[PDB]
């Protein structure tokens, strides 16, 4: 059973890592690039980019622990804990050469620690559409002159009493459509068909709970990153952000400058949070070109 | 028929104001004091203060339009629109003399415009536990290093797609309990009985919707108040705020200083957002004394 259609010439498989069964989709030949998805989605967000990359690279796109078809983590949901699973997974496929990394949203939270702790293992890096967990996240507004703010859901998801699961259980499809479209500029790409696919996956009770545990570990991740960030990233880095409704805008690059010696940033106009889907052509081009250097 | 028990010597009644049937509880004799409740509650939050106040004043406690047993507004939920109903209701009972006003939470939003526009009508003013809608509300954080922030619900409630109603329907009691306790220092004062009563009231479909329409109009209220605030308040004013978990702290007085010429403030240590219930005795004393001098 596959929750999402595997692109032609790719394989859907599993790898046990530190006692946790991770799902991934793999294809292509050459140096390894790992694509890491974010909240509300799965490996599938990369399905348009993967075939193009596979012409030049071995491409792997894992489901985050607890999400998609991956088992929940056995340690915890903090960035440093989850990063161990992903680092080891990647190294199974690339034990003797560095690999490339592309991450979106909370995929960033869950990879940053393994990047900074294993810089030699990372050839090139692309981060898009999410803050690295640090003190900056405490400066985002709860509410804006336009209406709901970008990250009020941080509090909603982090709240005690399993507030989010209790309210959202049984209404996953409704909530995800609102969440996704409210963070989008090009909302039309989110057909009812596509939303059905994503909603069915995160409606798995352990997946719905896992989703929110990432936010419940967010403050811990911030504390972890305060130590780790004492060493800057040395490898070539690119940031992408949407310049349209729901996007991070200039924040993405500006924060990254504090973390990386070598960074170039792009803000994509008319695109919100969901770059791979809202703005596939320019995003795919930017990523392929950067990794192909 | 009554959603809440009426105190001895008070009457539950209704008055039509601009085609809208308002519910209120009234008792006592002497000059008028109007007490205006806020979100999650009804006239009943004042039930302990009312009998004491009724020794010196005529006391009226209306249900906000759409909430408790009051009909929804026929105009709209913005502060300036709602305030008309409350102003006219007060005038029905105090036509020939200024009246006092005490407001809590969104009761502030729904009274400020009529206060600033009809100052000759307001003898003394007491505001507690909520910002007057202005640009300051855009500074509150979406998330904190301790978990959920104070006002992330501004975005949750203001969201379209009837996000709040859809998620909370069928879980009204569960949500209200979490919301109250997340903004409380003293949770023990909220018995299952009391929570039952409040949950039953705001769970009425038109009341659940009404609750959130106040927030969907919040930005409009801010825009309205930016014009109204060009005229400073001249009547004697007192602010109260909780100094404990869930409270507004020093913000209440500091904001009010920008609005009122003659203001004194108190922060109550060990008290959260729900002053009339969490800290009934000291709040009652402070209000009664302020209004009695």
Beta pairing partners, B17: B20
Which two tokens mark B112? 């400020």
Burial of B52 (0-12, 13-18, 19+ CB in 10 A): middle
Cβ-contact A247, A107 below 8 angstroms: no
At residue A192, φ and ψ (nearest 5 deg) are -60, -35
Of A139, A155, A167, which is closest to B152 when you measure between CB atoms?
Answer: A155
**DSSP category for residue B233:** B
Contact A144 B150 (CB under 8 A): no
3-state helix vs strand vs coil in chain A, percent to 5: 40, 20, 40
Q: In terms of residues, how long is chain A?
A: 293
User: Which homologous superfamily does the CATH classification assign to the domain defined by A9-292?
Assistant: Alpha/Beta hydrolase fold, catalytic domain (3.40.50.1820)
Distance CA A262, CA B179 (A): 45
Smallest CA–CA distance from B169 into chain A, residue: A167
Identify all chain B residues contacting A151, using CB atoms and an 8 Å cutoff.
142-143
H-only helix segments in chain B: 49-53, 79-93, 106-109, 112-117, 153-158, 163-168, 172-182, 192-202, 205-216, 218-228, 251-257, 275-278, 280-292
Cβ-contact A21, A67 below 8 angstroms: no
Contact B140 A138 (CB under 8 A): no
Beta pairing, strands B10-17 & B122-128? unpaired
Cβ-contact B207, B199 below 8 angstroms: no
Distance CA B283, CA B86 (A): 23
Contact B168 A163 (CB under 8 A): no
Residues after which a C–N gap over 2.5 Å breaks chain A:
none
The angle that helices B205-216 and B218-228 make with each other, rounded to 10 degrees, is 50
Report how far apart, in Å, the C-alpha atoms of B230 and of each of A34, A135, B163, B254, B256 are: 57, 36, 35, 17, 14
Count of CB atoms within 10 A of residue A96's CB? 5
Cβ-contact B42, B276 below 8 angstroms: no
Select from B72, B99, B62 the least CA-distant residue to B18: B72
**Is B226's Cβ below 8 Å from some Cβ in A?**
no
The angle that helices A205-216 and A218-228 make with each other, rounded to 10 degrees, is 50
At residue B205, φ and ψ (nearest 5 deg) are -50, -45
CA atoms within 13 A on the CB side of A127: 30
Report how far apart, in Å, the C-alpha atoms of B43 and of each of A51, A207, B81, B102 are: 63, 42, 20, 12
Of B147, B155, B171, which is closest to A148 when you measure between CB atoms?
Answer: B155
Where are chain A's structural domains? 9-292
Which two tokens mark B209? 């919707």
Of B137, B160, B175, which is closest to A167 when you measure between CB atoms?
Answer: B175
A-contacting residues in B 155-194 (Cβ below 8 Å) = 155-156, 158-161, 163, 166-168, 171, 174-175, 178, 182
At residue A213, φ and ψ (nearest 5 deg) are -65, -30
Q: Does residue A30 come out as left (phi exceeding 0), alpha (psi in the -120 to 50 range) or beta?
A: left
Cβ-contact A209, A52 below 8 angstroms: no
Distance CA A277, CA B7 (A): 60
**DSSP category for residue B232:** -
Distance CA A32, CA A60 (A): 7
H-only helix segments in B127-171: 153-158, 163-168
Distance CA B218, CA B261 (A): 25
Contact B140 A137 (CB under 8 A): no
Q: Which residues contact A1 (CB under 8 A, 6 or more apart)?
A: none
Select from A174, A144, A146, A155 the least CA-distant residue to B179: A155
Distance CA A167, CA B275 (A): 27
Select from A68, A85, A111 the least CA-distant residue to A18: A85
Taking CA A147 as the corner, what is the angle to CA A143 and CA A149, rounded to the nearest 5 degrees?
45
Contact A140 B144 (CB under 8 A): no
**Is B140's Cβ below 8 Å from some Cβ in A?**
yes
Which two tokens mark B54? 């009724």
Contact B140 A142 (CB under 8 A): yes
Cβ-contact A248, A274 below 8 angstroms: no
Collapsing DSSP states into helix, strand and coil, what is residue A98?
coil
Smallest CA–CA distance from B155 into chain A, residue: A148
What is the 3 state secondary structure string of A20-68? EEEEEEEEECCCEEEEECCCCCCHHHHCCHHHHHCCCCEEEEECCCCCC
Distance CA A265, CA A251 (A): 10
Contact A160 B147 (CB under 8 A): yes
């Amino acid at each position: 059973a596959e929750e999402f259609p595997v692109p032609n010439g790719f394989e859907s498989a599993y790898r046990e890592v530190d006692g946790v069964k991770l799902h991934y989709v793999k294809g292509g030949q050459g140096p390894l690039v790992m694509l890491v998805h974010g909240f509300g989605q799965t490996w599938y967000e990369w399905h348009q980019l993967m075939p193009e990359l596979a012409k030049r690279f071995t491409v792997i796109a894992p489901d985050l622990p607890g999400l998609g078809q991956s088992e929940p983590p056995k340690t915890g949901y903090s960035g440093e804990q989850v990063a161990v699973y992903l680092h080891k997974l990647a190294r199974q496929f690339s034990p003797d050469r560095p690999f490339d990394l592309v991450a979106h949203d909370i995929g960033i939270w869950n990879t940053y620690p393994m990047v900074v702790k294993n810089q030699a293992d990372i050839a090139r890096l692309v981060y898009m559409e999410a803050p690295i967990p640090d003190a900056r996240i405490y400066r985002f507004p709860a509410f804006t002159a336009q209406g709901e703010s970008l990250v009020w859901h941080f509090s909603f998801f982090a709240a005690d009493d399993r507030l989010a699961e209790t309210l959202i259980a049984g209404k996953e499809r409704f909530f995800l459509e609102h969440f996704i479209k409210s963070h989008a500029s090009n909302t039309e790409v989110f057909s009812e068909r596509l939303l059905d696919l994503y909603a069915r996956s995160y409606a798995k009770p352990h997946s719905l709970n896992a989703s929110f545990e990432y936010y419940r570990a967010l403050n811990e991740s911030v504390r972890q990153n305060a130590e780790l960030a004492k060493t800057r990233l040395q490898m070539p880095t690119m940031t992408l952000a949407g310049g349209g409704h729901g996007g991070m805008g200039t924040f993405q690059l500006e924060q990254m400058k504090a973390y990386a010696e070598d960074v170039e940033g792009h803000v994509l106009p008319g695109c919100g949070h969901w770059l791979p889907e809202e703005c596939a052509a320019p995003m795919n081009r930017l990523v392929i070109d950067f990794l192909s250097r």
